[PDB]
Design a binder for this molecule. Structure first.
Ligand code: NAP
Ligand code: FOL
Ligand code: MN
Ligand code: MN
Ligand code: MN
Ligand code: MN
Ligand code: MN
Length: 159
């Protein structure tokens, strides 16, 4: 199956000038927990934003142009990205905006972090149809000394 994982600020903002302005260690821990030992698919802009391979995961990069780093796998289409994952139980799509839009129709599961932060962004998570999805898990956290915003971890499964 195909899953998307993302962290959304107010109004579905996910990025700004190819960066994520906030700093929520608890959410990066959740990201690692839910992606470790799975293949991760990302667009080239997100690969540049991260800046290095994510350890313990097969890193698959979508780009129309030839790859520039053999520590990761480069593919030229959505179907090639899926095939390069091989036979695994769960494929994790980790963005960004343009990649989320292409894989959302194929996804069975969404791992969403809702961050109570106002951010002026240039990239958004796609505007999906709420009736298509059932919330099967939600866990709210107040801000603390390490995490400056409150946040909610939610998992949604396609009905
Ligand atoms: N908060 C979050 O959860 C989260 C997660 C991920 C990213 N982000 C943020 O999202 C932003 C980046 O998102 P973005 O929409 O600008 O870019 P993106 O989706 O990361 O990358 C888009 C690039 O991927 C390649 N691509 C996408 N689909 C393709 C296809 N079907 N075939 C071939 N190549 C394909 C193209 O590369 P080429 O131009 O080389 O062809 C395209 O320019 C950054 O701000 C990042 O920080 C946020
Ligand atoms: N929920 C969620 N939060 C995010 O921050 C996020 N970020 C991306 C894309 N950007 C990034 C940027 C950095 C790292 C990163 O450094 N991850 C480490 C953190 C480990 C830790 O802090 O415990 C990793 O090994 O995964 C991952 C993705 C995609 N989906 C997301 N999904
Ligand atoms: Mn507004
Ligand atoms: Mn296709
Ligand atoms: Mn197969
Ligand atoms: Mn806040
Ligand atoms: Mn749309």
């Amino acid at each position: 199956m195909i899953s998307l994982i993302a962290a959304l600020a107010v109004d579905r903002v996910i990025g700004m000038e190819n960066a994520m302005p906030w700093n929520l260690p608890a959410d990066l821990a959740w990201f690692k927990r839910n992606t470790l030992n799975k293949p991760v698919i990302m667009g080239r802009h997100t690969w540049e934003s991260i800046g290095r391979p994510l350890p313990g995961r097969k890193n698959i990069i979508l780009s129309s142009q030839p790859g520039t780093d053999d520590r990761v796998t480069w593919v030229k289409s959505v179907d090639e990205a899926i095939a390069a994952c091989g036979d695994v139980p769960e494929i994790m799509v980790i963005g960004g905006g343009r990649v989320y839009e292409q894989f959302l129709p194929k996804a069975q599961k969404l791992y969403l972090t809702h961050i109570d932060a106002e951010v002026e962004g240039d990239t958004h998570f796609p505007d999906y149809e709420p009736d298509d999805w059932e919330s099967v898990f939600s866990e709210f956290h107040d801000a603390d000394a390490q995490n400056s915003h409150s946040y909610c971890f939610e998992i949604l499964e396609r009905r």
